[model samples]
Target: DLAECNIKVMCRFRPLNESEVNRGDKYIAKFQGEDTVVIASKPYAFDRVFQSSTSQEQVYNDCAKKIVKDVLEGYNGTIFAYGQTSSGKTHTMEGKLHDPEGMGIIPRIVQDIFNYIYSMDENLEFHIKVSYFEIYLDKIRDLLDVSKTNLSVHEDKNRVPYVKGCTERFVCSPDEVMDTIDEGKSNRHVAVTNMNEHSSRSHSIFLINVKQENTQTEQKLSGKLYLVDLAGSEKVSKTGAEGAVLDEAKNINKSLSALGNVISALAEGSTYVPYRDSKMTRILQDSLGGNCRTTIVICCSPSSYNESETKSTLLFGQRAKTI
Candidate 1:
């Protein structure tokens, strides 16, 4: 990042989906240069900016490759996406899992991590494990195991926060890791409607733990890579929520604001960052503005129809970049 050593906010604007085009929407967001974008003729700067033509491989190499490499070296790493509904957050995080050309950051990270491990010598014993979960309506739900509901966050003696009672499945190869993710994907909570179908309704977190030990000296080191796909950025008013959907909207909106508040507090050097206000923030305390090398992908749609939501994400990215 230009302003920080560990945090980077990269802006990526995706082309309009079929629905937006059907609604007669025209492109309003476009890139000005490699590190800037313009929305409705207003410009915003970021550590990096990408437009419609940017390839998935380029995004992974520029924004995520370093984080994955660092995690193998005992440094924590996090990659998360924030944007409005149907803005391609999921597409950016977990593209076509089986397609080489279409695969996104997660699949690429899996391959890279295993590649690094196999490239290293046998002098060190390496172990890889994964944990997947979701924060839905402020409740912690383990994506890997259904019975482990209402899981809580706890702090280690060293003050590092982690999820308690969540299932962690160890993997010996990249194939096993993908299978773990596929299993979790089937258990996540998804709501279907005309607009929300196929778009995620909860923030999904995929955690990969890498540990190693020197065979001779018995010295051990470990790191965790967190890949988070955040909930939709749409406001409740436009979504026309009610009943269970209204409850979901309220909780999602509240947790999203808590994340912003925590970032602002960290930027201001305030005494309290309020990470405990929401389960999502609490679980990610160390991942944002802290010890871990963090990368935030701000996804946006290329249409003025989402002007308000689109602008809100850019502003948040600017604040994060400043910090």
Candidate 2:
């Protein structure tokens, strides 16, 4: 349930890397325009995305710490990434071994769980349970428990219900959670289209449930932190895919169009916003129009020749600014 006034939004624009170039086989970092900033794969750092004095670790801590504050104060929060294909959504959200740094938002977030807890008031004991799932073939499959299949999505009254084939489990350490995240990420079905090699072919959600009890009054401070790395949204015509890849592109674009419709409706402050149109919008119901505090990091690549992609990216940001 939502207990906050509104969710905070944060957007980051990272520079394009070699994986982004469609024709050129070689990977290099070069500026496309004066407005665009180029980022390096090795020795990563945010170059003026935001003017903050704190380290990246501290920035992550700030995000977690703020969410914890809201939760304790009676509010749910969400963190989500949105963008087109090969714009470093995966790299920004969760880095691959190709990088020498060997870490991303996922691990840093795992570490901050303890950081936030230890920095707390000390009168409350917190319990955490994590659940991971992916929506494939328009179905929600629990990543943890693959045996329990055929999980469906439903809506009852004003609330939505989804069976995420997996159940929630408590986490003892960052290592365990990190390992679980990696396992789930690996289990996710990915395929290449014309746009990217190993492009994500499924919609995934990772939920962290936080339950707290005050030692004195025994009051509950319960909330959920949803860290979502959405599959890239792109056009199949541009991707030039066929067979299953083409089918996956069609599905991805369809859902993304639905998302755009919802975003438009919400931005217009329509009372009849359509959140039930897709599984993605349904599970994220609490985050979109609900009272939960939501933060969105929109990823983008700035290549001069990629006019269509760049135009779409700007339009998305403009619309999102309305929200």
Candidate 3:
């Protein structure tokens, strides 16, 4: 019964994309030690900060490996990647489809989990199931099964929240886990609009459930891990979209805004936090001031051209830090 809810928000600075560099984007972010970053004469402190040159291996070792271990030990955990569009959220959470070290936190954590399970006792019973879903236009859809669209959020007797009727695919190997994610990725609500290239317009959440029953002691423990890749946090007015595109942008803003409101309440220690404001917040009810170890990495562009967006993410990261 180890119930500790520690929220660690970290920051990641990515190299200026060639396009930004070609447009003469200037470096606007600077690091002061490993925990604080400064931009536009403002400083944002985090539990940790990673420079652009940091290796993916280094990131996982520092940020998530321990969380993976804790999850197997029966502690629920959540890791979320959030930032403006093309600010490296994808690179931070789900990098190369078939790469590790070259990959991102999601795959790295899964790999560590399975390897740890392999080294455990042979008779130990382990049941692992995964679910993938996305919140697009404020509607929840199971990425693993498209038919499960507009899924509703509900709470069990214990007040543990989950997407009702979402597919929870069982997997025996980490490779299979990635396979399921790849399958889900294909079903994501990605569309090409005037916004930008095929950037993820929807927030995606990936879940891995680990259960173990120790026969010698008849002890049972279960832990669930949530990996979230949020949609871009840029403003809706900044987009040159219309019709369905405008509708999508509106909801994306609403979801992110709802989350911001939720965090503001949490950061201020408000008793009546409004988790019901958005499906994303409802699904993450446990992570916000609840009994789940949580980590949020705010990815940001180092280019001055995006100072406003970068500052917003950093400000969010600062506010999201919790004890």
Candidate 4:
């Protein structure tokens, strides 16, 4: 039987980065209790909350570890990081896998999957494939190959959405998966900006498809997991964006706004969920509010200068839990 669970909302605070420290910015957010944070004197509760000093493994243990196992069974799972630019979303999702303390959720989940597969019964056979893509300028681009930009999004008869014409690399081991992740990361759209030096300019999605068969019962099962790192929603005035940067900021805000609308609609139990509002939401329709288990990690900075955006981020998390 499938385990039915509602969407989860998590909050993570990133310690003041070097740039903020150099500028003498003071932290304006603090933990009130275990799972509650006081931001600008406003308290908000979440399913789980992580302090800035929380370890990467600790973060995964709290929520992500279980999702990995659920996906191994027959359940679809999705984990997406949401926050402002340089607030640790990227660090939490795609940190260095080699470093014990720095390894992020993606690498940890990958390692766990292989461990579970190896420990399975010998009568069972498994196959895995991975696809990596990004949504930029409201268009889906294959991260594996830059040439395959502007891919189409479609849904099967079951209304399960998918990106068509994207490359899916088959892998037998975690090392191969790691290599694929590295290649995809190298091809992502990143650049320096006033807000962040190495800012991701688009929503990066990494998907894993797993299929297993039992020789004894002749039973087949499949599951999927989507790990998404969204681009930070920035104010053009604060980011000092101009020219192409300005255009990117507008697109990012537009898509993120669309996401907010979708979540709000889901939270309110409205009959109309605007999945077609943006490419990100459209591609994530199935996993967002349907049968899959979804989790959102809202990352925020402690600096008081970012109080307004941080407050908005926290409120977004609060609303998403309703889904």
Per residue, candidate 4 scores C-alpha lDDT tens digits across 228-301 of: 99878665444444674445444336678888888777767666889999888888777676667788889999
Per-residue lDDT over 1-323 for candidate 3, one digit per residue giving the tens place of the 0 to 100 score: 12333667888888888999999999888889889898877788888899988888877777788788878988788888889888898888889857755899988888878888889866678899999998878888888888888899999999999899999988999789989989987766344243333345678899989999877877888988889888888764445547744454443466778877877776676667788989888888875555567788889999988998888888887766555
TM-score of 2: 0.74
* lDDT of model 3 at position 170: 89
Error of 1 at 43 (Å): 1.2
Clashing pairs in 1: none
Over the stretch 37-99, how does candidate 2's per-residue lDDT look in tens digits?
343432212212322122345335444456655655656666666677666566556665223
Clashes of 1: 0
> What local distance difference test score does each model get?
0.81, 0.59, 0.81, 0.81
Q: How many clashes in each structure?
A: 0, 2, 0, 0
True-vs-predicted CA distance for residue 139, candidate 3, Å: 0.2
lDDT of 1: 0.81
| Residue 10 miss distance in model 3 (angstroms) | 0.7
Model 2: how far residue 19 lies from native, Å: 5.7
Per-candidate RMSD vs. true structure? 3.5, 6.5, 3.3, 3.5
